[PDB]
């Protein structure tokens, strides 16, 4: 063929550009037709002294200028042994990617490496995401999300900021001078003025595309069209939000 999937590196930094998370995600198309794509996604990441493996499958179908997808994931925090299943839906067009995700616990309360004296487990929740790019300047991207989790003492803004049934709204900007490279900044905000600024450095390798074209400013417009976005990584939270008791 022509396109054999995507590998993505992410490095995320806090306000002080202190590195908070590193990840590698890989999407592989197993069956690729002009209307139906079946893929696998495999991910690994390190965050707050924890390593998580994500394993998912997904389908995408194309109709009348739109792409509709479904996906599911098994997420596995290997460090604290926390297990989660996820479901995801997609509705994407040229320049515009919408997504909804649900996250569900598979295991129950067990000892926590974070708090001697209390238990942890996956918090149930979901999110709504939108990624948009400017047709007049497709290197410029915007992002909005809403997240909500259920629980008494949920670590949405980290373990030193546990909250009851918290939410977060994110607003972010990002710039992709070249298909290989994206830089972004996000603001995340919740109840009681909880707040987070996050900086993202992202690399994208598109298997089968020439290296030169992935270093071309003029190739970026094309990355925002369905013929290519059909190969994008699933837009979800690959980290397991824990709650505590």
Ligand X SMILES: CCCCCCCC/C=C\CCCCCCCC(=O)OC[C@H](O)CO
Query: Rule CB under 6 A: which of 157-216 touch ligand X?
Result: 171-173, 180, 185-187, 197, 203, 205, 210-211
- Sole binder of ligand OLB in the list 100, 140, 181, 226 (CB under 6 A): 100
Residue 59 binding: pick among ligand X, ligand OLB, none (C-beta 5-8 Å cut-off by kind): ligand OLB
Q: Is 58 an interacting residue with respect to ligand X (CB under 6 A)?
A: no
For residue 220, the surrounding DSSP H or E stretch is helix 220-223
- Sole binder of ligand X in the list 13, 50, 57, 228 (CB under 6 A): 57
Contact of 123 with 151, CB cutoff 8 Å: yes
Residues 106, 198, 67, 53: what is their CA dihedral angle, to the nearest 10 degrees? -30
**Euclidean distance between CA atoms 243 and 109, whole angstroms:** 9
* Closest residue by Cα to residue 240 from 82, 113, 112: 82
* Closest residue by Cα to residue 198 from 168, 170, 234: 170
Residues 102-141 that bind ligand X (CB under 6 A): 102, 104-107, 124, 126-128, 130, 132, 134-135, 140
Residues 27-66 that bind ligand OLB (CB under 6 A): 36, 59, 61
Beta strands in 64-136 (DSSP E): 66-77, 82-93, 96-105, 110-111, 119-122, 125-134
Residue 187 binding: pick among ligand OLB, ligand X, none (C-beta 5-8 Å cut-off by kind): ligand X
Smallest gap from residue 224 Cβ to ligand OLB (A): 18
**Euclidean distance between CA atoms 219 and 212, whole angstroms:** 10
Instruction: Please identify, among the stretches 126-134, 154-162, 180-188, 204-212, the one whose residues bind ligand OLB according to the rule CB under 6 A.
Output: 126-134
- Sole binder of ligand OLB in the list 55, 57, 128, 185 (CB under 6 A): 128
CA end-to-end span of the chain: 52
Residues 133-162 that bind ligand OLB (CB under 6 A): 144-146
Contact of 38 with 231, CB cutoff 8 Å: no
* Closest residue by Cα to residue 141 from 202, 80, 59: 202
Note the helical H segments in the chain: 211-214, 220-223, 226-229
Q: Is 227 an interacting residue with respect to ligand X (CB under 6 A)?
A: no
Residue 145 binding: pick among ligand X, ligand OLB, none (C-beta 5-8 Å cut-off by kind): ligand OLB
Smallest gap from residue 210 Cβ to ligand X (A): 4
Name the phi and psi angles at 60, rounded to 5: -135, 135
**Per-residue contact flags (x/-) with ligand OLB for residues 71 to 90, judged by CB under 6 A:** ------------------x-
- Residue 73 or 244: the one with the smaller Cβ distance to ligand OLB is 73
Q: By the criterion CB under 6 A, which residues form the site for ligand OLB? A: 36, 59, 61, 68-70, 89, 91, 98-100, 128-130, 144-146
């Amino acid at each position: 063929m022509n396109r054999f999937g995507t590998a993505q590196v992410n490095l995320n930094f806090d306000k002080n550009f202190s590195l908070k998370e590193s990840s590698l995600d890989w999407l592989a198309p197993w069956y690729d037709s002009a209307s139906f794509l079946f893929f696998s996604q495999l991910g690994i990441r390190n965050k707050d002294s924890r390593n998580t493996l994500n394993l998912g499958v997904g389908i995408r179908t194309l109709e009348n200028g739109w792409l509709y997808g479904l996906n599911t994931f098994y997420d596995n925090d290997l460090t604290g042994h926390n297990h989660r299943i996820g479901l995801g839906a997609e509705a994407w067009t040229d320049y515009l990617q919408l997504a909804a995700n649900g996250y569900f616990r598979l295991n129950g309360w067990h000892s926590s490496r974070d708090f001697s004296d209390y238990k942890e487990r996956p918090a149930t929740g979901g999110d709504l995401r939108a990624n948009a790019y400017l047709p007049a300047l497709p290197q410029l991207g915007g992002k909005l999300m809403y997240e909500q989790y259920t629980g008494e003492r949920v670590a949405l803004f980290g373990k030193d900021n546990l909250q009851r049934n918290p939410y977060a709204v994110t607003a972010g900007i990002n710039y992709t001078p070249v298909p290989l490279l994206t830089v972004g900044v996000d603001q995340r905000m919740g109840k009681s003025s909880k707040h987070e600024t996050q900086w993202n450095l992202q690399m994208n390798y598109r298997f089968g595309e020439s290296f030169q074209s992935q270093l071309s400013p003029s190739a970026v417009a094309g990355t925002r069209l369905l013929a290519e976005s059909r190969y994008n990584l699933v837009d979800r939270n690959n980290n397991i939000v824990l709650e505590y008791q």
